[PDB]
Each structure stands twice: as structure tokens, then as C-alpha cells.
Design a protein around this ligand. Structure first.
Ligand SMILES: CC(C)(COP(=O)(O)OP(=O)(O)OC[C@H]1O[C@@H](n2cnc3c(N)ncnc32)[C@H](O)[C@@H]1OP(=O)(O)O)[C@@H](O)C(=O)NCCC(=O)NCCSC(=O)C[C@@](O)(CC(=O)O)C(=O)O
Ligand SMILES: CC(=O)SCCNC(=O)CCNC(=O)[C@H](O)C(C)(C)COP(=O)(O)OP(=O)(O)OC[C@H]1O[C@@H](n2cnc3c(N)ncnc32)[C@H](O)[C@@H]1OP(=O)(O)O
Ligand SMILES: CC(=O)SCCNC(=O)CCNC(=O)[C@H](O)C(C)(C)COP(=O)(O)OP(=O)(O)OC[C@H]1O[C@@H](n2cnc3c(N)ncnc32)[C@H](O)[C@@H]1OP(=O)(O)O
Ligand SMILES: CC(=O)SCCNC(=O)CCNC(=O)[C@H](O)C(C)(C)COP(=O)(O)OP(=O)(O)OC[C@H]1O[C@@H](n2cnc3c(N)ncnc32)[C@H](O)[C@@H]1OP(=O)(O)O
Ligand SMILES: Nc1ncnc2c1ncn2[C@@H]1O[C@H](COP(=O)(O)OP(=O)(O)O)[C@@H](O)[C@H]1O
Ligand SMILES: O=C([O-])CC(=O)C(=O)O
Ligand SMILES: O=C([O-])CC(=O)C(=O)O
Lengths: 1037, 181, 92
């Protein structure tokens, strides 16, 4: 997409980045004048204004300024001040477009003669760059293509000075041959270094002091921004005159540049009442022509497109932007919103339409009170869900929404909107049944679709032989051949895939725009690959020309970048062409037909598939060459391929605006090279009715000359003998008429409709439709990983953090599914803190240290330590809790409990310490006990345990309440004393081992700390001394 | 058992599951110490055929961030004195989101870079101590200790629901046994 | 019902090649268990079938058995035996 930059930006870039031996003059010497700024500030930072004379001219991409009298030459500072006022901020009309003047440029007046008025131009073409040099430049330049000297510099070819001196410096003065030539070379080096597509200098004046540039018109390849974002800086692309750009256009441009998907939005008339949601550049263009053919060109508001499978969020953002744009002003008749598009090949209709319905739900109020009516037509993957969700969103919001499916001819909704109709060497053959292809990148959905297409085409082997993904090792990816399971190899390197699969002759490059060039260049080094399909959109034009040059040298056929690919029914399918298997069967693309078509668009290729299937026998082969400016293969390649192909009987060509490519069809037909019937239509007539230079979604959808208009191409094809319909509406009818005329003469003999092989439905598809039942083998109630937000037992994580929960609160949510009070969470945290570690002498810490000193792992060492947590070590928490709970529920007094447990012979769990007996408690039992007294509402089990402790202390001083016993009794009291739990819930949680989890979680901290300490101290392998083992082995066994 | 179930769950904590924390921390620390700019780091990762650890979500891309990367990021901005590696990772995140919208700083990568910043931008540690703690697997322990709560919660949930013995369906397994060995 | 009739198509999430529990007889990597016990292969033969999916010769299976024999135990002082003893004395 070549975008025109302002004169100020162009001269700034030229001054900063040119490298010439000539003394460039007036470097960084200009001034910007805008209505919304002060004046003195422009003075003290520009002292040159008073030093020399001045000249003023509007820099808003306006040409013919001198002929229209918009320039004031040879005026002083006061002169230019007096000159601006009658024009600054005023209304002007250039050509057909009218607009205001918010930008002016001030530069020194250069005293120059007519003899030094030089014309320079460098503009890119498919084969290279044309440089036009005219000695008598300026206003009297006259004809340029017939008088100015022209020089071609090929792709990846340098412009040496002597070629310029000979071919381009014939009529120039001799004394300035050298420096000027150097300047040209430097300017030429400036051209491809910053990926300029058009650079026009007139006038250019050279004097003994140096060189001077007066005006320059520059169009630069915006898609190369990721290569020049350092050198361009914050480059701005001004809108054409009379466009009055808006910040939402900038937002949509940033969204488009932020992702591989294409999101184009251009506000033609904010006061209009017709707005469009049409997916794809070709669909957008044809919808624009359909609207303009009904007289809605004046009421058309915006031109927009979303392609490249936009996601949920991107589509939602674009829809909310357009909805906020259409809410500003209220129209008495109402507003019309058209959600159109072709039959999508791989754009998920469900996700895009879900984003759209979310935006509608967010802006339903203003939409309802604006009387906005929505008409929707869409087809492609999961279009049923999109149509239905539109149905319920329209029903619930009350917005009048009328949705339609594939049965609509893609233009009935426009007629229903405006009240016109009621609302109800390169090879000749590239692919065959034995074609094997290699897919670059993880595109399992596209490969699976290709395999399904091969199966329904009764192919012997799958068309995908290998897959290439540089970010993973070699393995096998599991796919389906019909119903049977197959494995397709996936390689890290292209060389291995080419070595192990010598039968592969096609590459389908799914690499992004940043990797498509390198991948294609590497693939072209292998002679076995005869066809390469590039899917990526946004590749810089110069890189694409480099690919075309290498392919032409090597003879490889490039399916132009930014395409869905192509389809040959019965033989081969590229990528996601033709939609899912349902669209393949509906369009009967599993067997060959007799019509072969070429189109720029990808979704419109599927529309052509549908039209040809409905009106004729079928499709023999269909190719979408892409919407880029320079496709890898033009119309000539594929049309000549079809003409040389005996299988076809008729050809359909569906071009777009810009590019003298259909005139090549006309010239080929002129001497009879093309003999088979041809039906050609060129979309883009709506560009003739617009008072602007709007750039369509396709990069190559830009008409530079006046002969590249759609009307001119259609007319020329009309006298060329091509069956050209009146509009896109009559394309189906004219194609059907041509097919009937051709079959009436016996040229076409339709074959018998053999049913295709049956492919089982996908399980996920059946679940989505609610067709089958499969019981769930699991059940969880603690955490919800799916959804927009992480959920902890009903509480979102953001709500978890806003409520100022801690480890205790999250633990309660995850373990008990309860909203515990603050004191309960703090008590849980304290219990985890006191059980964190108790030294390395215990069994678990010992095992952790042993595993760590073996240099095994953090997880392994923690695991070995934790596996000793059981009855003897770490189970005293749960054992004491159960013991005291049973004693308390039995109702026996503590003395009776102590006597019973003495007589029966089991130790009282949670009672008894070694050294700390009295006047020196455990002192971490004291902390938890004090907290429990302070904060716990009721502690009956704690009081019972304390009475038991008082009884047992009279026996021996060391029989006190342990940390384990205190934690157990206080945890039971917390469970059965707070309102979160009933008695049954607390009993179940105690029985299942909640306190075991408490102890394990607490001691995990200490075990991991022990592992980290052992790693930090760098301890070697431990072997137990033999003197501490005491072998007692038997005498002989 | 509780211990056995927690243990079997924790044994999967390794490179592929739960290892993005330490891997992302080491990757970003090496990138920051090497002195290369974030663009050079991204290009070096792409050339080596390595995915940037801690970058990339499945659904949450823009206008809908992770809702838990945001909380930690806001806390780190508000409380942490200086976060150089966090800024470096955020520049890398900007570049990756310029590539693809859902290539955002994951919770693993965010926690890794913020933990490195907390280690080496507080007065407690010298640079070599922070490097050693990163090397020996401090974030591995952090992830294991955090996910232990969820694993014990899962065990308790399964016990409370009284789920029976699991047997994987035969239709979900592909038997590719040899013809006769 | 839809899987038996082949109306739906669900990819399998697991792949195995060592043992086939289903059917009228247990299979160890292509060889039935009865056949496994017919040619008198022992621990070595079963180990080879399960680990390598190969019919190892008799000397290879006997050598595998000998390797298992010599690595059976090497005292309690080693780290693994020490950890086993520690976990056992905890009565776990
Ligand atoms: C090209 C592709 C297939 C895939 O490209 P993606 O960018 O998505 O994925 P990636 O290749 O992974 O690239 C992302 C980068 O992030 C890197 N990365 C990943 N993980 C990372 C991590 N963890 N850390 C660091 N980095 C990581 C990865 O390494 C890569 O790095 P890099 O190579 O440098 O870029 C996609 O763009 C695409 O389809 N374009 C469409 C273009 C096109 O043909 N249009 C016309 C077709 S007709 C149409 O559509 C209209 C219509 O609508 C019709 C209708 O409806 O009417 C219809 O549908 O028919
Ligand atoms: C995680 C933790 O905090 S550890 C929790 C452990 N839980 C327990 O209390 C288990 C049972 N009790 C114990 O084993 C104590 O912890 C210990 C280790 C102090 C008891 O070990 P001992 O060395 O036997 O202590 P001591 O020698 O003072 O015990 C002597 C007498 O007290 C009795 N006794 C010891 N512990 C208990 C108890 N918990 N309940 C009742 N009586 C006990 C013994 O029966 C013994 O009987 P005797 O009078 O016939 O000799
Ligand atoms: C599976 C295996 O067979 S082990 C294979 C190990 N891998 C290798 O072979 C790689 C290189 N090997 C080595 O590191 C060395 O050659 C070794 C370890 C095999 C040789 O052992 P050394 O390095 O001499 O240390 P060693 O194991 O002898 O220990 C020193 C002494 O402690 C004694 N000792 C060994 N184990 C114990 C124990 N559990 N308690 C008390 N004393 C012990 C030994 O008798 C030995 O006595 P010595 O020094 O008089 O011979
Ligand atoms: C080492 C051993 O032999 S296990 C020893 C167990 N001993 C005991 O516990 C004795 C008590 N007895 C019992 O509990 C029962 O009699 C059992 C479990 C032994 C017998 O099994 P059953 O109760 O009939 O249930 P079974 O295990 O057959 O499974 C039910 C069905 O699911 C099917 N099935 C089994 N595994 C799977 C799987 N992975 N995927 C899908 N389906 C499966 C079985 O084919 C069975 O159907 P069938 O009866 O038509 O063959
Ligand atoms: N610095 C300058 N010194 C002298 N004349 C200038 C200067 N800048 C512009 N001009 C005048 O502007 C005219 C160029 O107009 P032109 O480039 O044909 O308009 P447009 O760019 O709209 O086609 C020249 O005739 C020249 O005399
Ligand atoms: O590890 C602990 O918590 C202390 C312990 O069990 C003991 O009494 O030996
Ligand atoms: O020799 C073995 O079998 C291994 C072993 O126990 C040792 O020496 O560490």
C-alpha cells in the first residue's frame, strides 16, 4: 500500500538521509504554518526568515498549485503574512475535490534561471524502477514519457554513475555532469533504502553554490514500516485534499498495523446514513459499487473491510469504533448498517459476529434511539452461529436486524436497504491428483481441510507430505484421512523435509509478512518445488519484486502474496481455499467442471465458486492471485495456462481497479492467442463516483493513470469480444448464458454426478450443534480456568485481591469453597507460619537434604521429603483433631477421657513435649493460643483440650498441649464455630484430611528452603557411615 | 493419600509444565545482562528458533489483559523502587504485540522478571546472590509452593465429591503395537 | 452409539505401542502373554518386549536379567536406600 507523504516529511527525510558528494543546500530549511499556532514561536527558532526572501505554498498533497495560483513567489515575511490571510483557513476547490487549507510551507526563495529547471522522477514498476530526467523541467516540462530520458534499473541492480552520465545526462550542461549525476545516484540510493515507491522532484535547480529542491511528491510503501520505523520516525501520511481525516481512522490504521489481519476504514461522508461491515477488499469494493449503482454514493458514509480472520477483540473494537462514528449525528430517515461479505474461506464467522454482537450490546441505546437498521449477509466457517447470535442480539436489543445466508446473492441486502426490492520455464499444469505439498508453519486446521478435500476427491494419497515449523523439533502430527488416523512428519528445517520427500512439488508458505520473504527465498533454492503459494499480507513491494525476479530466473510459479491460494477440484487445494468441507460439498468442488476462473480477491473466489457451481457444470480450476500491487503470477500466466489446458472450456476473469492487466487480455485475444470463451468483470466502478482518491483494502487497488479505471477496462473488454456483464449482479446470468450457449453446441459434455466419499463429522462440531452426548469423566468445583477471568470457587481473582485476601483467604476458597472471615484467614496463615520448618533433624527435612545433596531437583527433593509426612511424622495434627473431636462429641469429661485412654493403651494425640514443660512453653503454642483467645468467637474444643492438658500436666510437667494438638483443636473450633460451615461440612473436612494438607503446605516452605540451602552451600553426595549401620545379616541363606 | 496425590501432581512440575517461570526469568536476565536492545533480543530469539519464554497468551491479547498480570504489574509499579528488567520485558512485549496481538507478557514471564527485579533491586541481595538464587531454582520453588495449594484443593474436592476410580476410555488411545515381535 | 456407527470423528489424545490390554488375551508388544510364556523367555524377554518392542535373543534377555541381578542392592548406606529406610521407619 503506497501512501503519499507530505512535502515537509519528504524533504526532511531527504535532508537527513541523503548521501551525496554534492553540496546539498538548504538542509532542514523550512517552516510549517498552521492556523492553530502562535507566530513569534515560529520566529525565534527560525532566524533565517528575515535573512533571505521567502516563498509560501500549501503542503496538503496539492498539485498544480502554480497553475491554480495557490503559490506566492518572491514575497517578504510581511508579504507572506499578508498573503496567508485571504487563503489561510479558507475554502478551496482543486479539480473535483474541495477542502480547507490547514497546512502551509515557508522556504527561502532561490534565484534560479529557466536553463537550470530540472525534472527528476523515480517510480517503481514490476520489472524495476524507472528514472525520468528532463533538462527543460518545471512548468514547461510538457510531455514526460516522450521527451524526458528514461532509464530502467532492474531489481537487485545498482545504478552506477556512468550509466546515468551516458543515458541520462545528454542534454544537460557539461560543467555540471559530475555533481548532478552523483546527486542522482545519491537520490537513487535514497529511493530503495527507505522503500520509496514514487519520488518526483520538480523544479530542481543547480547553481555554482549547490543544488536546491523546490517541490517533491513522494509516495512510500507503508507496509515496509517494520523495516524503516527507525528511519521514518513518527512519519505521518496526510489524507487527500478534501478528506478531513479523523482520529478513528488513525485508530483503525494502528489496529491494522498491530496484527497480520487487515482492518481498513475510511470516512467518506460522516453525515451519511449507510455503513458497511463487509469482509475482504474485493467484497468491500463490490458492495461499494452495488451501493453507488442505486444512487447511494452521496449518502455512503464509510468504506471499510476486515480480512485476515480478525479475532474476537479486533472485530469488537472495529465494530465499536464504527458504531460510535454512526452515533454522532441523527438522520431523519434513519441509518443503515450493512454487515456483508463473501463466503469466508477461513475467517471464523462465529468469532467476528460475536464481537459485532458484543459491540451492538454495548451501543444498543444510541442505536435504538438513532433508528438504525441492520442487514446482514454472510457465509463461511461456522456462519450458522454468527447468523443466530445476530438473531438473538437483534431480538433482545430490539434493533431491526435482518440476517440472510448463502442463498442471498450478496447484493440483495443492498437493494433491501435502499428500498429497491422487498425483504423476504513455468509449467502449464501446476496441480494434479498426485501433487504433494509441504506446509510451512503450524496450520493444522488448513492441513486438515486439505486432507478432507483430498479424501472427498478420492485421492490415493494426502496432498500434504510434510510440515515445516522452525520453532519445534522433528516429530509427527496426527491427522485424519477420512476416518482413519495418519501421521504427517513435521521438521524443524526445510532441508530435511526436502531431503526425505523428493516427490514434493508445491510449497504453501504460511509464514508471516516478516518471514515470507526469507522462507520463499530459501525454498526457491530447491529445484523440486515448482509452485509456491504465499499467504502473508503486507509484504513490502520491493521484497515481492525480488521474489518475482528470482522465481522468473528459476522458473517457479508464485501464487501472489496476500491470497487464500487456489483450488483444483478433484486434484488439489491450497490452504483454506473453498471454506470448510461443507462449502466444498455444497459447491460440488470435489469433481472437475469446465469453467476456470482467476480473481484478485480470496473470498470473491469463493463467491465465484458458488456462482459457477449454481449456474454451470462446475469449476475445473480456480486461482486467486492476491490483492498485492505486484502478484507473483499475473492474469497472463493463469489465462495462458487455462488456454493451453484442454480440460477447460470457458474462462472467467474477475479483476479490480488499477493496473493495465486486462488490456493484456484484450491484446492476447486480438491476434487469437485466446480462443476459448472469456467472461471478464472489473470491480471498482464506484471509484469513478467518489470525489477523492480513496485507497481500497487491496494494496494493488490503486489506479495511477486514467486508463486503469474499472469502466475503461470493462468497456475495452466489451469491444475486445469478452462477455462483460452490466454489473456484478448480472455476472451469474451472463455466465449461465455463456455456459448454455457452449453446451448447446456440444463443446461441453457434463459428466454423471458420482457421490463423493463420506467424511465423519467432527466431535467438537457435533457438540457445538448439540447433536451428541458424552458423559464427563471428571468433576471439579474449586477453580474455573476457562472464561475471561480466573475464578477461585466462585470469586474472581480481581475480587480476590480487592477484598484484601491473603494466603489464608485463597486457601479457604480453594479448599473449603467458603468466604472465611478475616480472623480465620489470619489464623490459617499463622498455622502455616508455625509449621513452616522445625529443623533438619526431622525425617522429611533429612530426606529433602539427602535428595538435594544428590543434585537431583527441587521438585524431587521436596517430594522425597514430603513422602515421609504420615502417621509418625506430620500426622499428629489430624490425629489430635480427630481424637479430641471424638472425645468432645462423646460427652465424657476430660478426666474420664484421660483415664479411658490410659486404660486402653493409646497415647493422647497432641499432648507431650520433650524439654519445654512449665515456665517455658513451646512459645509458638502461646502465640496461636493468644490469637485464638483474642479473635475466635467460641472455642469449646480448645477449652476441652486445655482441661485435658491441665489434668495431664499434674502427671508430668512435659505433658502439655503440643503445636500439633493446639493447631488441630483450634482448626476444628474454627471449622465448627464460624458460620461458613455446618457440623457435617466440618466433620467431612476433618475426616478427609484438611489438617494433613495444612501441615504439608506449611512444611513445604521449610523443605524448599532446605533444598535451596543445600544447593547454596554446594554439598556433595551423602553416604551413611558404616559404623552406624550395624549389619545383622544371617549366616547363610 | 493427600501426600501421595499432591506428590504425583507435583512430579509433573518441570520444563514443559510450570517451568516457564524460571525459564522466562533466566532468558530475560541473560538478555538484559548481554546489553542487547529488546528488538535485537527478539530477532536473536527468532533466528535461533526459540520462542520467547513468558510471552504469549491464548485468548487475552489487548483491551482484555490477563486480569492477574495487571494486578502484579500495578503492584510492582506502585511499590518496587526500580524495575529495569520489567521495563525491558515490557519493551519486548510491545514488540511481540506489534507482531501478534496475543503475544503479551504471561503471568509466568511477569512473575519471573518482577521476581528478578525484587531480588537484585533491593538492598538485601548483591548481584551474585540474586544470580545464584535464580540459578538454583527459587522460582521453581515459588511455583511449586503456589500450585501445592491448588493441588491440595483438588484432592479435597475429589474426596468430598467421592469420585470413583478413573479408567481412561479405550477410544481415546491409539494402539500402534507392532504386528508380531 | 455415534462412534460405533461412524457418524462422528474424535481424535485420540494418547498413543501406545507396548501393551494391548483389550481383547481376548493380553499382548506384550505384538506377542500374546501365552506365547510369551511358550518360548520360555523370562524377565529379560518381557523387559525387552515392553521397552524395545523387540524379540531379543536368549543371551540378551539373560544378560538383562543378570544386569538386574547385580544392581539389585548395594547396601543401605547409599542415598536411595537411606531414604527408603527413613521413610519406612516413619511407618508411611
Ligand atoms: C500468515 C498467517 C496464516 C499466520 O500468521 P500469524 O501472524 O497469525 O502467526 P505467526 O506465523 O506465528 O506470526 C506471529 C509471530 O509471533 C511469533 N511468536 C509466536 N509465539 C511467540 C512467542 N511465544 N514468543 C515470541 N514470539 C512468538 C511467531 O514466531 C511470528 O514471528 P514472525 O515470523 O517474525 O512474524 C495469518 O497472518 C493470515 O492468515 N493472514 C491472512 C492474509 C491473507 O491471505 N489475506 C487474503 C486471504 S482471503 C480473506 O481472508 C478474506 C475473507 O474474509 C473473505 C470474506 O470473508 O469475504 C476470507 O477469510 O476468506
Ligand atoms: C508435631 C508435634 O508437635 S509432635 C506431636 C506428637 N504427638 C504426640 O504427643 C504423640 C504422643 N506423645 C508423644 O509421643 C510426646 O510427643 C512425647 C514424645 C513427649 C512422649 O515421649 P516420651 O519420651 O515417652 O515422653 P515421657 O518419657 O515424658 O513419657 C513418659 C510417660 O508419659 C506417657 N505419655 C507420653 N506421651 C503421652 C501422650 N501424648 N498422652 C498420654 N500419655 C503420654 C507415656 O505413656 C509414658 O508412660 P510411663 O509413665 O509409663 O513412662
Ligand atoms: C555404580 C558404580 O559402580 S559407582 C560408579 C561411579 N562412577 C565412576 O566410576 C566415575 C568415577 N568414579 C569415582 O568417582 C571413583 O573412582 C570412585 C568413587 C568409584 C572410587 O572411590 P574413591 O573416589 O576412592 O572414594 P571411596 O568411594 O573410595 O571413599 C573413600 C573411602 O570411604 C570408604 N567408604 C565408602 N562408603 C562408605 C560408607 N557408606 N561409610 C563409611 N565409609 C565408606 C571406602 O571404603 C573408601 O575407602 P578407601 O579410600 O580406603 O578405598
Ligand atoms: C488384577 C485384577 O485382576 S483386578 C482384581 C480385582 N478384584 C476385585 O476387586 C474383586 C471384586 N470384583 C470386582 O470388583 C469386579 O468383579 C471386577 C472389577 C473385578 C470385574 O469388573 P466389572 O465390575 O465387570 O467392571 P469392568 O472392569 O468389566 O468394567 C466395566 C466395563 O467397562 C469396560 N472397560 C474397561 N476398561 C475400559 C476403558 N479403559 N475404556 C473403556 N471401557 C472400558 C469393560 O469392557 C467392561 O465391559 P464388559 O463387561 O462388557 O467387558
Ligand atoms: N524556492 C523557490 N524559489 C523560486 N521559485 C519557487 C520556489 N519554490 C517554488 N517556486 C515556484 O513554484 C513553481 C512550481 O510549481 P509546480 O511544482 O508546477 O506546482 P505543483 O507542485 O503543484 O505541480 C515554479 O514555477 C517556481 O517558480
Ligand atoms: O517437625 C515438626 O513440626 C516437629 C515434630 O514433628 C517433632 O516433634 O519432632
Ligand atoms: O554399585 C551400585 O550398584 C550403586 C551403588 O550403590 C553405589 O556404589 O553408590
Amino acid at each position: 500500500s503506497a501512501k503519499a507523504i507530505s512535502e515537509q516529511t519528504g524533504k526532511e527525510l531527504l535532508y537527513k538521509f541523503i548521501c551525496t558528494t554534492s553540496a546539498i543546500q538548504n538542509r532542514f530549511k523550512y517552516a510549517r504554518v498552521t492556523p492553530d499556532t502562535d507566530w513569534a514561536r515560529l520566529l525565534q527558532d527560525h532566524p533565517w526568515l528575515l535573512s533571505q526572501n521567502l516563498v509560501v505554498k500549501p503542503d496538503q498533497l496539492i498539485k498544480r498549485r502554480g497553475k491554480l495560483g495557490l503559490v506566492g513567489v518572491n514575497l517578504t515575511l510581511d508579504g507572506v503574512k499578508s498573503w496567508l490571510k485571504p487563503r489561510l483557513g479558507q475554502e478551496a476547490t482543486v479539480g473535483k475535490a474541495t477542502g480547507f487549507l490547514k497546512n502551509f510551507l515557508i522556504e527561502p526563495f532561490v534565484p534560479h534561471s529557466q536553463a537550470e529547471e530540472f525534472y527528476v522522477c523515480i517510480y517503481a514498476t514490476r520489472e524495476g524502477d524507472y528514472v525520468l530526467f528532463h533538462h527543460e523541467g518545471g512548468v514547461d516540462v510538457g510531455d514526460v514519457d516522450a521527451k524526458a530520458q528514461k532509464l530502467l534499473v532492474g531489481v537487485d541492480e545498482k545504478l552506477n554513475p556512468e550509466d546515468i552520465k551516458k543515458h541520462l545526462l545528454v542534454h544537460a550542461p557539461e560543467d555540471k555532469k559530475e555533481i548532478l549525476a552523483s546527486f542522482i545516484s545519491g537520490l537513487f540510493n535514497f529511493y530503495e533504502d527507505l522503500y520509496f515507491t514514487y519520488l518526483e522532484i520538480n523544479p530542481l535547480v543547480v547553481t555554482k553554490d549547490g543544488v536546491y529542491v523546490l517541490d517533491l511528491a513522494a509516495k512510500v510503501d507503508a507496509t515496509a514500516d517494520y523495516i524503516c520505523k527507525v528511519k521514518w520516525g513518527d512519519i505521518e501520511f496526510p489524507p487527500p485534499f478534501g478528506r478531513e481525516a479523523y482520529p478513528e481512522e488513525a485508530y483503525i490504521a494502528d489496529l491494522d498495523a498491530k496484527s497480520g489481519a487487515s482492518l481498513k476504514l475510511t470516512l467518506l461522508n460522516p453525515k451519511g446514513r449507510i455503513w458497511t461491515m463487509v469482509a475482504g477488499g474485493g467484497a468491500s469494493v463490490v458492495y461499494s459499487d452495488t451501493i453507488c449503482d442505486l444512487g447511494g454514493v452521496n449518502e455512503l458514509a464509510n468504506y471499510g473491510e476486515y480480512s485476515g480472520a480478525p479475532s474476537e477483540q479486533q472485530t469488537y473494537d472495529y465494530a465499536k469504533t464504527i458504531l460510535s462514528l454512526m452515533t454522532r449525528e441523527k438522520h431523519p430517515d434513519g441509518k443503515i448498517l450493512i454487515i456483508g461479505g463473501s463466503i469466508a474461506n477461513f475467517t471464523n464467522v462465529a468469532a467476528t459476529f460475536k464481537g459485532i454482537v458484543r459491540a451492538i450490546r454495548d451501543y444498543q441505546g444510541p442505536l435504538k434511539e438513532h433508528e438504525v437498521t441492520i442487514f446482514v449477509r454472510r457465509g463461511g466457517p461456522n456462519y450458522q452461529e454468527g447468523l443466530r447470535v445476530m438473531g438473538e442480539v437483534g431480538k433482545t436489543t430490539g434493533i431491526p436486524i435482518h440476517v440472510f445466508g448463502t442463498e442471498t446473492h450478496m447484493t440483495a441486502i443492498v437493494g433491501m436497504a435502499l428500498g429497491h426490492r422487498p425483504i423476504p520455464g513455468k509449467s502449464t499444469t501446476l496441480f494434479s491428483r498426485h501433487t504433494k505439498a509441504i506446509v510451512w508453519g503450524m496450520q493444522t486446521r488448513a492441513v486438515q481441510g486439505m486432507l478432507d478435500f483430498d479424501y472427498v476427491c478420492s485421492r490415493d494419497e494426502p496432498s500434504v507430505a510434510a510440515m515445516v515449523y522452525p520453532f519445534t523439533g522433528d516429530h509427527k502430527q496426527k491427522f485424519y484421512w477420512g476416518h482413519k488416523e495418519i501421521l504427517i512428519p513435521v521438521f524443524k528445517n526445510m532441508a530435511d523435509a526436502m531431503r526425505k520427500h523428493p516427490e514434493v512439488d508445491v510449497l504453501i508458505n504460511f509464514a508471516s509478512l516478516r518471514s515470507a520473504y526469507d522462507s520463499t527465498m530459501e525454498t526457491m533454492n530447491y529445484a523440486q518445488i515448482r509452485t509456491i503459494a504465499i499467504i502473508a499480507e503486507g509484504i513490502p513491494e520491493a521484497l515481492t519484486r525480488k521474489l518475482i525476479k528470482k522465481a522468473d530466473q528459476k522458473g517457479v510459479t508464485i501464487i501472489g502474496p496476500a491470497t487464500v491460494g487456489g483450488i483444483k477440484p478433484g486434484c488439489f487445494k491450497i490452504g483454506n481455499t473453498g471454506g470448510m468441507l461443507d462449502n466444498i460439498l455444497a459447491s460440488k468442488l470435489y469433481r472437475p467442471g469446465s469453467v476456470a476462473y482467476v480473481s484478485r480477491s480470496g473470498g470473491m473466489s469463493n463467491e465465484l465458486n458458488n456462482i459457477i457451481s449454481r449456474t454451470t457444470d462446475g469449476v475445473y480450476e480456480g486461482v486467486a492471485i492476491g490483492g498485492d500491487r505486484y502478484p507473483g503470477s499475473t492474469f497472463m500466466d493463469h489465462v495462458l495456462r487455462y488456454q493451453d489446458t484442454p480440460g477447460v472450456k470457458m474462462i472467467v476473469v474477475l479483476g479490480e481497479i488499477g493496473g493495465t492487466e486486462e488490456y493484456k487480455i484484450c491484446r492476447g485475444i486480438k491476434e487469437g492467442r485466446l480462443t476459448k470463451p472469456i467472461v471478464c468483470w472489473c470491480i471498482g466502478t464506484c471509484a469513478t463516483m467518489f470525489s477523492s482518491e480513496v485507497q481500497f483494502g487491496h494494496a494493488g487497488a490503486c489506479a495511477n493513470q486514467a486508463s486503469e479505471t474499472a469502466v475503461a477496462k470493462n468497456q475495452a473488454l466489451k469491444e475486445a469480444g469478452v462477455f462483460v456483464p452490466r454489473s456484478f449482479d448480472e455476472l451469474g446470468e451472463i455466465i449461465q448464458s455463456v455456459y448454455e450457449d457452449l453446451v448447446a453446441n456440444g463443446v461441453i459434455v457434463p459428466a454423471q454426478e458420482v457421490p463423493p466419499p463420506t467424511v465423519p463429522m467432527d466431535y467438537s462440531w457435533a457438540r457445538e450443534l448439540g447433536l451428541i452426548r458424552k458423559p464427563a469423566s471428571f468433576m471439579t468445583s474449586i477453580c474455573d480456568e476457562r472464561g475471561q477471568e480466573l475464578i477461585y470457587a466462585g470469586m474472581p481473582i480481581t475480587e480476590v485481591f480487592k477484598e484484601e485476601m491473603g494466603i489464608g483467604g485463597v486457601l479457604g476458597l480453594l479448599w473449603f469453597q467458603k468466604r472465611l472471615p478475616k480472623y480465620s484467614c489470619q489464623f490459617i496463615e499463622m498455622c502455616l507460619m508455625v509449621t513452616a520448618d522445625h529443623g533438619p533433624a526431622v525425617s522429611g527435612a533429612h530426606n529433602t537434604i539427602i535428595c538435594a545433596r544428590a543434585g537431583k531437583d527441587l521438585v524431587s527433593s521436596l517430594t522425597s521429603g514430603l513422602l515421609t509426612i504420615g502417621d509418625r511424622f506430620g500426622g499428629a495434627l489430624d490425629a489430635a483433631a480427630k481424637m479430641f473431636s471424638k472425645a468432645f462429641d462423646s460427652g465424657i469429661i476430660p478426666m474420664e477421657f484421660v483415664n479411658k485412654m490410659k486404660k486402653e493403651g493409646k497415647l493422647i494425640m497432641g499432648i507431650g513435649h520433650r524439654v519445654k514443660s512449665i515456665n517455658n512453653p513451646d512459645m509458638r503454642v502461646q502465640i496461636l493460643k493468644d490469637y485464638v483467645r483474642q479473635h475466635f468467637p467460641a472455642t469449646p474444643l480448645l477449652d476441652y483440650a486445655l482441661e485435658v492438658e491441665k489434668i495431664t500436666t499434674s502427671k508430668k510437667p512435659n505433658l502439655i498441649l503440643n503445636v500439633a494438638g493446639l493447631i488441630g483443636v483450634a482448626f476444628v473450633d474454627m471449622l465448627r464455630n464460624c458460620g461458613s460451615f455446618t457440623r457435617e461440612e466440618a466433620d467431612e473436612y476433618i475426616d478427609i484430611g484438611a489438617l494433613n494438607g495444612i501441615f504439608v503446605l506449611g512444611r513445604s516452605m521449610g523443605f524448599i528452603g532446605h533444598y535451596l540451602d543445600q544447593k547454596r552451600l554446594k554439598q556433595g553426595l551423602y553416604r551413611h557411615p558404616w559404623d552406624d549401620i550395624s549389619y545383622v545379616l544371617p549366616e547363610h541363606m
